[PDB]
Design a protein around this ligand. Structure first.
Ligand SMILES: [Mg+2]
Lengths: 1337, 79, 98
RNA sequence: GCAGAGGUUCUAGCUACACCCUCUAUAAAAAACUAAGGACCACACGA
DNA sequence: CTCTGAATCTCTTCCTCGTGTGGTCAGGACG
DNA sequence: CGTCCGAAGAGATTCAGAG
């Protein structure tokens, strides 16, 4: 219907145009009669008639009298709904500043005038006079002059000089100033002054002035002469409550504002003394401030119940504001709620639903069908028929529920699968029945959990619900390719009990014709459910070109595993049902079924497996009892040993051999050892103790105990959750987190001591409070993630970009956390992968890596695969399908259009509730060892030493893959050589953790140059070996006398001539910094790789993810080499040491300040490339993006957040993190304007500058260069081109103020904009409509 | 009756244009007197449109050309 | 708490804060995001416009469903008009281009 | 059946979301029928 | 003496839906 | 019968160290 939305500063004439009148009486209504006040806030003439086409007097009461006002009262007669849009204005006697521009953080009014805000709101509050047009005076146009100084000026500036005060005075200033003149005046100060901070302030002023010379806005408009009022129906009298008519809302603020305005009018016409008039003007200013934004001053005006009364800005911001309460998400009709019920008889495509709920929700449909069939002539009679619940109504109801999906909806819809469609099955009752499989997807319990049901109305709505939202269409969660409808708790236990074996069970040994015979034997009761019997199966495989071949063989198995064979579809092999079939096995089964058979066979197989699991779990009778949890017989002796050990430790501490700290550490260690021992004893008693024969003498099998079956199967439970039942509960921590010295030895099968239960409830309360805080933190993170997203949809199909990220299996010192098979699956490569054979196109350039390709990758032993990343995509206002990859919910490429920003945000934020809050190098296995970027010189010991700093051991096996990766500290000696085969279990590199060696690159004679004993390095004594060792004094500790001279170590030969670096004219000098112990004195020869000086030397929870996504700089940021070159030092650590890096070829205009306490891994004789770390500690993403590139920072953040998610046992595909990061760094800064219109200081969206410079480079012109910058989610979201999106997120007042100053027009084009407006969403079915609309323009 | 729309989306590889075309088909069936080509089995319009798409005889191109022909004989009705 | 049509609120959000008072459940911001994640732009649009606050839209949808033609007359949410009036009343002209 | 009135009932009924018939300045042979309002703050609880 | 970095001060939220209750400008008398 | 009175981080704002 309508084009883009624009926002601008409201001109007073525009306000007059808006208003259909002018309110004068403060009074709203009469109580004598609910008729509105003649000139009050509720008024008929100003805002239209109260009743539908009736006047106040009632002279005209029919529709034919529309468009004519009354006579005695002169009120227009029209619809009452017109009263919801007619506005009015208040003619303020004295102009009042708008608080939004006044008390803004940047202070629009103050910044525009380039004067401090203290002065501004001093002159607003009538306690200091500004000097309008000072002219031929000492005082200037922008000058403060309080009462006494004003009198001092007045008594001797009695000329025509005038210095107005108040908001009128600032209006005078704003009128006097010319915006263009100020811009051209400040341009030369911008071009001249070299101060960074000062120029930053000048640009901020220039931006404000430019945003007013471009937009049709006048600076004077900020001061508001007329105050608009809302339509009365938007701020009504509130329900009568028996005539009480009372609520502290806008009506009250408007009443007080009108009262003050009338008082000012009376005083102005009365010519009251200036002090009283000034006080009343201050009161009016405070009233307008409270009206617009209450709480933007010290005292928030308070209504009844002594609470801040909601203002005109409290209803546009916050959770209860109009945006997030009525636009972003709004209540809906055709909706009902009830507790949920299992109802296993249902299929996941359908759900149970009460008759009353179907009758109430589908009332219009029932009325329509009744009218069509003629059962009721009219809607009114049909409605009565629905009330009578006549039997004919139920038959009609069954017709409108045949194929009408409903949207089951749980309240905390964390992710996409929170709401799913279902075909309602009419059930008698009052509880909605939810299919058991989708409970895991819903994260829904059956403990009073309630979920709303919504009824799609239009054919488009029902049809898209059926096509997309059906549980049949949602098998794989959007977070990862793993199935989401997997048998979760009880059916998995039934399958696990089904697929086991006794070594001697009834009916074991005989051969079975097939699964039918197995079912016949089990049901007849003459053969046990799980007995090892050979069966004949017709296994079907599709190894042909889609054709299924039949293989018949006698596979040894059990009866229970044979039962499942008739359930599985034809394509699945028998090797998947021949195991114990725990939770992981069933998940792998369902994934293979989805990837082989498809979707419909997977749905049918899931339903059948659910049926059989439930049925045979019922037949199993897998109960729980006291005898089912066994106490280890060795638990008593383990407890006795632990008590003896703690007694010995306490006795040692009493003597004084061990102090408190080491005693505490020893006790904790020995109690942990006892806990591990008792846990192992419990597991042995729970899975090994079972003794059962084989018709022979004796045999031992895996236990059939109830708790072991319910825990090992993965049905429900874990290692700690089973330890806390039979074994020692373990050391339980205090509130602060420090461990109680004495653990809760007693388990839950036995009783607990009162102190033991006190520690237990300490831990439980800590966990409950942690969960209560963590769910709120995760909700906030999900909101931020969604809103930094929601403008990113798959707009194209391909971009032809060769860029991407090189996907490599992640190694964090240990084993392979995620193999490349599960890391690149579903993503489209960027360049051809090759096997060890070179120039081999194993996988072509632009083929999606499905299961077959990934399986081929593993057997070809690939190491690193370059893949097209969503970050590297060059598509504007979206990304292409190929750069994203698989949908992760359907086995194909992402559909052109589907919104992936919201999918990624929900996938990231869903596990937020599941998160938390608080040497030597040894080879592991056999394999080759090669080093990357390594410089080594053979020493006299035959070992290997490293000259580079980022040498990093990668362990290559005989397959060519990197089994292990270890970081090599500088100077660490390597026992083995390059490419030397090593056997797992022996250390290859070892070093002193508290020592930084200065090992020499080339052996030879070293002369002590600039070494003075007494001034630079004092010869300290030694009380340990008897031979003194030279220790270099610290620069801060040593005086300036020994500080000016530069310590150095010159290398010479036997003839005394200097030795130069191989290939470098610079001699191999070495600098010794402070605190460097030099055992080797002068005249001592040094071999290669010999140490010269022995220089001596976190969170992973939800807050870590929040910091990572907000791009928070760490408390101790790691310094990275901004430029590549040699290192030089400047100041003598005068408070802040400065470091300068100069390249061999280029200039050195970069200087960095480094505090003394920061450890430096770099010296002044080595070459460091750009991005190499200098200090130690966490590195901010901003520096990584600036130096190492966008791909490097994307990889860093993806790896960090995945490692955070790894510890909690939750897996999220890296594409979600990648797209969120792409949305994070969508802003760019133009370092050189070039020929583009963009200014240098200006930062613009990367899409804008990319489009502009690609257009400029399309022809002979040269495009402008830019510098991309990374900013946090909560900062990228507000800093967006859409004002209506940033306003809806956070800081609504600031965003709206900046938009109104800018005059910027929102073009919609984002999911959340079109949601707020209420039009089609450019995400799914609306994407085609939006692209048609664009192509029609 | 139908449970899943898989074969339909292998017929129409968009999963989004499928909804639009079947919605147009359902609109033709309800608002107009159009007879569904697959005979119904006591099925609603929104599912019989998906049945029509499943057999492959109804999609965006056939629907567009069919409505274009209907418009053509609509001009030709008055000669 | 099942409901089809009932009395509406000040902002004209139809469900009227569901309780004893006959109400519809708040299709909150999380559920809107969930539909956005799906390829849902018709059910979301209908349930954020013609099912909640569009007075002309609501009346037309009711008349259409009782007629038998489940056709959405989109219109515009009245909550957005309320927001426009509230932002204008602050003194910030926010309008639409035709 | 769109601007009004009348009719057999029951003050009033003209599509008000709304139910039957008449015509453009005139009132009755006729059974099924009728109503279109409604906030915030706190508490407790559930998931 | 004028900015530099740094301490200080101020703003801006800090989940998402339900179900029961209860309390809320309060003009007041005079032409 | 009507009518007039913790907490956590970011950014602006001082504010300060050093030549
Ligand atoms: Mg539950």
């Amino acid at each position: 219907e309508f084009d883009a939305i624009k926002i601008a500063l409201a001109s007073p004439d525009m306000i007059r145009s808006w208003s259909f009148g002018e309110v004068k009486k403060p009074e709203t209504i009469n109580y004598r009669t609910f008729k509105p006040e003649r000139d009050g806030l509720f008024c008929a003439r100003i805002f239209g008639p109260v009743k539908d086409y009736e006047c106040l007097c009632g002279k005209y009461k029919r529709l034919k009298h529309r468009g004519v006002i009354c006579e005695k009262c002169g009120v227009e007669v029209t619809q009452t709904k017109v009263r919801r849009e007619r506005m009015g204005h208040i003619e303020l006697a004295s102009p009042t500043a708008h608080i939004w521009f006044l008390k803004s953080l940047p202070s629009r009014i103050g910044l525009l005038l380039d004067m401090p805000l203290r002065d501004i709101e001093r002159v607003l509050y009538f306690e200091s006079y500004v000097v309008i047009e000072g002219g031929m005076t000492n005082l200037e146009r922008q000058q403060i002059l309080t009462e006494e100084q004003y009198l001092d000026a007045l008594e001797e500036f009695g000329d025509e000089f005038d210095a107005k005060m108040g908001a009128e005075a600032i209006q005078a200033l704003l009128k006097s100033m010319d915006l263009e003149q100020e811009c051209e005046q400040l341009r030369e100060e911008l071009n001249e002054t070299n101060s960074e901070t000062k120029r930053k302030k000048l640009t901020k002023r220039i931006k404000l002035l430019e945003a007013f010379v471009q937009s049709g806005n006048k600076p004077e408009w900020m001061i508001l002469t007329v105050l608009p009022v809302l339509p009365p129906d938007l701020r009504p009298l509130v329900p009568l409550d028996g005539g009480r008519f009372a609520t502290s809302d806008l009506n009250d603020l408007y009443r007080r504002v009108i009262n003050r305005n009338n008082r000012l009018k009376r005083l102005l016409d009365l010519a009251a003394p200036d002090i009283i008039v000034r006080n009343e003007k201050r009161m009016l200013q405070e009233a307008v401030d409270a009206l617009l934004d209450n709480g933007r001053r010290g005292r928030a005006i308070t209504g009844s119940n002594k609470r801040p009364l909601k203002s005109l800005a409290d209803m546009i911001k916050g959770k209860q504001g109009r945006f997030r309460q009525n636009l972003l998400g709004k209540r809906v009709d055709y909706s009902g709620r009830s507790v949920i019920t299992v109802g296993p008889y249902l299929r996941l495509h359908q759900c149970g639903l009460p008759k009353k709920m179907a009758l109430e929700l589908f009332k219009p449909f029932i009325y329509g069908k009744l009218e069509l069939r003629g059962l009721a002539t009219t809607i009114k009679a049909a409605k009565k028929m629905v009330e009578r619940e006549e039997a004919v109504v139920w038959d009609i109801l069954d017709e409108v529920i045949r194929e009408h999906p409903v949207l089951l909806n749980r309240a905390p819809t964390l992710h996409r699968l929170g709401i799913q469609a279902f075909e309602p099955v009419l059930i008698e009752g009052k509880a909605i029945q939810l299919h058991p499989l989708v409970c895991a997807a819903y994260n829904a319990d059956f403990d009073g959990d309630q979920m709303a049901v919504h009824v799609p109305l239009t054919l488009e709505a029902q049809l898209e619900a059926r096509a997309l939202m059906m549980s049949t269409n949602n098998i794989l969660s959007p977070a990862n390719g793993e199935p989401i409808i997997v048998p979760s708790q009880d059916v998995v236990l039934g399958l696990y009990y089904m697929t086991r074996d006794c070594v001697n069970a009834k009916g074991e040994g005989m051969v079975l014709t097939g699964p039918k015979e197995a079912e016949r034997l089990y049901r007849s009761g003459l053969a046990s459910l799980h007995a090892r019997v050979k069966v004949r199966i017709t296994e079907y495989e599709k190894d042909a070109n889609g054709e299924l071949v039949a293989k018949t063989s006698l596979k040894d198995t059990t009866v229970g595993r044979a039962i499942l064979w008739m359930i599985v579809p034809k394509g699945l092999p028998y090797s998947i049902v021949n195991q114990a079939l725990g939770k992981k096995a069933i998940s792998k089964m369902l994934n293979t079924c989805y990837r082989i058979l498809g979707l419909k066979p997977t749905v049918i197989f899931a339903d059948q497996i659910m049926y059989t699991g439930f049925a045979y779990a019922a037949r199993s009778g897998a109960s729980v009892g006291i005898d089912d949890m066994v106490i280890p017989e060795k638990k008593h002796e383990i407890i006795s040993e632990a008590e003896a050990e703690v007694a010995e430790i306490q006795e040692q501490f009493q003597s004084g051999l061990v102090t408190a700290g080491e005693r505490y550490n020893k006790v904790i260690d020995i109690w942990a050892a006892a806990n591990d021992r008792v846990s192992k004893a419990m597991m042995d008693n729970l899975q090994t103790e079972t003794v059962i024969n084989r018709d022979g003498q004796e045999e031992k099998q895996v236990s059939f105990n109830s708790i072991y079956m319910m825990a090992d199967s993965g049905a429900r439970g874990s290692a700690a959750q089973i330890r806390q039942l039979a074994g020692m509960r373990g050391l339980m921590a205090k509130p602060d987190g420090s461990i109680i010295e004495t653990p809760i030895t007693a388990n839950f099968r036995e009783g607990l001591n009162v102190l033991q239960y006190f520690i237990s409830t300490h831990g439980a309360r800590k966990g409950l409070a942690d969960t209560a805080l963590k769910t709120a933190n995760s909700g906030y993170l999900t909101r931020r993630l969604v809103d930094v997203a929601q403008d990113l949809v798959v707009t194209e199909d391909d971009c032809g970009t060769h860029e991407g990220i090189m996907m490599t299996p992640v190694i964090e010192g240990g084993d392979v956390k995620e193999p490349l098979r599960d890391r690149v699956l579903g993503r489209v490569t960027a360049e051809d992968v090759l096997k060890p054979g070179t120039a081999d196109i194993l996988v072509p350039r632009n083929t999606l890596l499905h299961e077959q390709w990934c399986d081929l990758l593993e057997e070809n032993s690939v190491d690193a695969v370059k893949v097209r990343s969503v970050v590297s995509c060059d598509t504007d206002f979206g990304v292409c399908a190929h750069c994203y990859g698989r949908d992760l919910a359907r086995g194909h490429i992402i559909n052109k259009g589907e919104a992936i920003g919201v999918i990624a945000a929900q996938s990231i934020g869903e596990p937020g509730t599941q998160l938390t809050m608080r040497s030597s190098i040894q080879v592991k296995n056999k394999g080759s060892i090669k080093l990357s970027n390594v410089k080594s010189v053979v020493n006299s010991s035959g070992k290997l030493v490293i000259t580079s700093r980022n040498t990093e051991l990668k362990l290559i096996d005989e397959f060519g893959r990197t089994k292990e990766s270890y970081k090599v500290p500088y100077g660490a000696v390597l026992a083995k050589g390059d490419g030397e085969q090593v056997a797992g279990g022996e250390t290859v590199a070892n070093w002193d953790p508290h020592t930084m060696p200065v090992i020499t690159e080339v052996s030879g004679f070293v002369r002590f140059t600039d070494m003075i004993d007494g001034q630079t390095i004092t010869r300290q004594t030694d009380e340990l070996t008897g031979l003194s060792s030279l220790v270099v004094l610290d620069s801060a500790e040593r005086t300036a006398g020994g500080k000016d001279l530069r310590p150095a170590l010159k290398i010479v030969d036997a003839q005394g001539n200097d030795v130069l670096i191989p290939g470098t004219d610079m001699p191999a000098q070495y600098f010794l910094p402070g605190k460097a112990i030099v055992q080797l004195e002068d005249g001592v020869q040094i071999s290669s790789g010999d140490t010269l000086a022995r220089i001596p030397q976190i969170t992973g929870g939800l807050p870590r993810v929040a910091d990572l996504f907000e791009a928070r700089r760490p408390k101790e940021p790691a310094i990275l080499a901004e430029i590549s070159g040699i290192v030089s030092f400047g100041k003598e650590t005068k408070g802040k040491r400065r470091l300068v890096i100069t390249p061999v070829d280029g200039s050195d205009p970069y200087e960095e300040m480094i505090p003394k306490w920061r450890q430096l891994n770099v010296f002044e004789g080595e070459r460091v490339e750009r991005g190499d770390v200098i200090s130690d500690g966490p590195e901010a993403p901003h520096d990584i993006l600036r130096l190492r590139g966008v791909h490097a920072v994307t990889r860093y953040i993806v790896n960090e957040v995945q490692d955070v998610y790894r510890l909690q046992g939750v897996k999220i595909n890296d594409k979600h993190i990648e797209v969120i990061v792409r949305q994070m760094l969508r802003k760019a800064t133009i370092v050189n304007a070039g020929s583009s219109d963009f200014l240098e200081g200006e930062q613009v969206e990367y899409s804008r500058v990319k489009i502009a410079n690609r257009e400029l480079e399309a022809n002979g012109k040269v495009g402008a260069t830019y510098s991309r910058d990374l900013l946090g989610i909560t900062k990228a979201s507000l800093a967006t081109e859409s004002f209506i999106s940033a306003a809806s997120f956070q800081e609504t007042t600031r965003v709206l103020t900046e938009a109104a100053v800018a005059g910027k027009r929102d073009e919609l084009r984002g999911l959340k904009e079109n949601v707020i407006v209420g039009r089609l969403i450019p995400a799914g079915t609306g994407y085609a409509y939006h692209q048609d609309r664009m192509r029609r323009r | 009756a139908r449970v899943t729309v898989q074969d339909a989306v292998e017929k129409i590889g968009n999963r989004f244009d499928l909804v639009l075309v079947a919605a147009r088909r359902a609109r033709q069936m309800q608002v107009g007197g159009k007879d569904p080509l697959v005979p119904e089995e006591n099925d609603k319009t929104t599912v019989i449109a998906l049945r029509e798409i499943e057999e492959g005889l109804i999609n965006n191109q056939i629907l567009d050309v069919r409505e274009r022909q209907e418009q053509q004989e609509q001009e030709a009705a008055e000669l | 708490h099942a409901r089809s049509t009932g009395s509406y609120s000040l902002v004209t959000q139809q469900p009227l804060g569901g309780k004893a008072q006959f109400g519809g459940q708040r299709f909150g911001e999380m559920e809107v995001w969930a539909l956005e994640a799906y390829g849902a732009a018709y059910t979301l649009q209908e349930m954020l416009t013609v099912k909640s606050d569009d007075v002309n839209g609501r009346t037309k949808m009711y008349k259409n469903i009782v007629d038998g033609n489940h056709q959405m007359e989109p219109g515009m949410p009245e909550s957005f008009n309320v927001l426009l009036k509230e932002i204008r009343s602050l003194g910030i002209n926010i309008e639409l281009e035709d």
